A paper describes a structure:
In this study, we report that one of them, named LrsL, is a metallo-β-lactamase superfamily QQ enzyme with outstanding catalytic features. The QQ enzymes hydrolyzing the lactone ring of AHLs are called lactonases, whereas those cleaving the amide bond are amidases or acylases. LrsL has an unusually hydrophobic substrate binding pocket that can accommodate a broad range of acyl-homoserine lactones (AHLs) with exceptionally high affinity. In vitro, LrsL achieves the highest catalytic efficiency reported thus far for any QQ enzyme with a Kcat/KM of 3 × 107.
To gain experimental insights into the mechanism of catalysis and self-assembly, we determined the three-dimensional structure of LrsL, showing residues 49–331 at a resolution of 1.9 Å. The crystals contain a symmetric LrsL dimer in the asymmetric unit, burying a total protein surface of 1,135 Å2 in the interface. Size exclusion chromatography–multiangle light scattering analysis confirmed that LrsL was eluted as a single peak with a molecular mass of 61.2 kDa corresponding to an LrsL dimer. The LrsL dimeric arrangement resembles closely the one of AidC, with an r.m.s.d of 0.952 Å. However, AidC has an extension of the loop between helices α5 and α6, which is absent in LrsL and most other lactonases. The crystal structure of LrsL exhibits a functional catalytic site where the conserved H151XH153XD155H156 ~ H236 ~ D257 ~ H304 (superscript show the position of amino acid in full-length protein) motif residues and one water molecule are coordinating two zinc ions as the metal cofactor, akin to AidC and other previously investigated lactonases. We crystallized LrsL without AHL but noticed an unoccupied electron density above the zinc molecules. Secondly, LrsL shows a unique presence of three phenylalanines (F197, F200, and F275) in a position where they can coordinate the AHL tail carbons C1–C5 particularly well, suggesting a strong interaction with the substrate. Minor differences were found in the side chain orientations of the phenylalanines F197, F200, and F275, and in the orientation of the helix carrying these residues. These regions have an elevated B-factor in the crystal structure, and hence the differences with the AlphaFold2 model may reflect this flexibility which could be related to catalysis/substrate binding.
Author numbering:
A (entry chain B), B (entry chain A): 49 to 336
The structure:
Amino acid sequence: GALRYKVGDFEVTALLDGYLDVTPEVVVGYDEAEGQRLRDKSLIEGNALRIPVNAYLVNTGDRLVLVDAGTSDALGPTMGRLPSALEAAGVSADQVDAILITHMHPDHLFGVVDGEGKRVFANAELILPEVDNAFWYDDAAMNGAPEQFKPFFLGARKAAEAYKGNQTLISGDQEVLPGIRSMALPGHTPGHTGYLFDSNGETLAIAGDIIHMTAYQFDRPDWGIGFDIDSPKAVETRKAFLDQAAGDKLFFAGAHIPFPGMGRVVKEGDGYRFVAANWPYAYTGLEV
Amino acid sequence: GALRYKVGDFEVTALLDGYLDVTPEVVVGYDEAEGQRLRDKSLIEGNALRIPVNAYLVNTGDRLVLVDAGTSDALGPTMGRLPSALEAAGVSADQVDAILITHMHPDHLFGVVDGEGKRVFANAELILPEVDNAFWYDDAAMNGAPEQFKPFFLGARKAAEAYKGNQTLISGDQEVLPGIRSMALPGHTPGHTGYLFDSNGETLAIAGDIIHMTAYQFDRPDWGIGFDIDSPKAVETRKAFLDQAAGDKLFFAGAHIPFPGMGRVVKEGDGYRFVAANWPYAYTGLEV
Ligand SMILES: [Zn+2]
Ligand SMILES: [Zn+2]
Ligand SMILES: [Zn+2]
Ligand SMILES: [Zn+2]
């Protein structure tokens, strides 16, 4: 679960932290006739979709930066593969210089701490969108939260705090590191943020949880998922993101797009068709 | 360039030998207005398509069988990756017991011998389709071939002769090993052959060069490629194959389908749409 691409002078390695299965009862706006038509289009039997959890290592030439860090053990044994995906890519955890968090959900942030609350990445700066940090640290929010979801707030704080004195809070429109700009993508969480990478005239947008179920939400970008804090907002941000991406032919990556999670969209009627990136033939089998 | 799937009790590993680039002049039946439409559909700029060269390792339980063997060094440094893909899959060349050849073209057969013309797979039986063997050994066919193509005949013969005494010729509808049957797929070469894997009510058809350019030939299965020895017969075989594959939702693999080259088709009009296999998340990620 490690695949390496070139973006100008940057190397981007897709990393598979694992997978989870979701059924229609988490889908906002779901209808069964339409759900079945969409599953039949992808030759999917039954109503479970298997969704990857992806993170991306970017070697900018002078820093090694992770976008998201998977789950650790928080959601069971089907996740937390990120540390061994890193080994596959020839990288140890102690070489990571910075971790850019799209949002502070379990499957993006919890992989930054181990079982003891020890840092997985000893030498990394933890970079958090400050709008998301504020939410997860708000008690009004945490106490108004369905009891089964309170562990998310608590777990998010514990993960962030293992990086006390090595955190940078960022806004949704700022240069973060050379050739990395944040991009506000609010809705899924309040401070959900994508990261735009640019090197030598080439671009990759790492767009976090802009989409969860690619079997449904390219065709029906109006469908949400119950884990969206603000589902109508998330819908507006996805439609805006995909409209832009389609018109610019922007290469993007998504945490829950079938691994490696990278490609482009064509606009089609009132939805989109994803065109997956080709396998990196030359990079792996020539260039280096 | 090694990905592992399960078909019943068989483990099937896709192996990437490398890639090559093709432009419209090799396409039989090509039309520029349609070519550009199909390239726009896949967001391809320019008119070059990069196609993989795939081979497949099948562990049957007690035996390691390759379907095809890549190119070696015979078409330049963009191919010949197979020995290193095998290494990445934790297998060395001396462990391979049998090589089932779909057809004796360079990108399938010549990977069985190194630059000095000695066996790459010291312990393997070379299994050749009898009908294709007959064609490549035909002096009349070799002598009536364009000058640039005569070395394909001579190189086929040398690669086969490296395995003299450890060769088995097979017919186009026979059992090769338990759960593995040959199936004639004539046209691309006279004895071009696919292999059908059947284990515990799961099937995989490894269909060789049934298709070359997936950006065109699923939409336009009536288009051929100049390397088809009889392009009309190749078209007929391809249409019959894809027609059956679509009606039974057969999982199949192709040597030139974007790596890992495995998936299914749905019929749309008198063309087809390819649905690529999911990444093998569970098999390679939930381990004992
Ligand atoms: Zn999320
Ligand atoms: Zn997520
Ligand atoms: Zn061929
Ligand atoms: Zn071929």
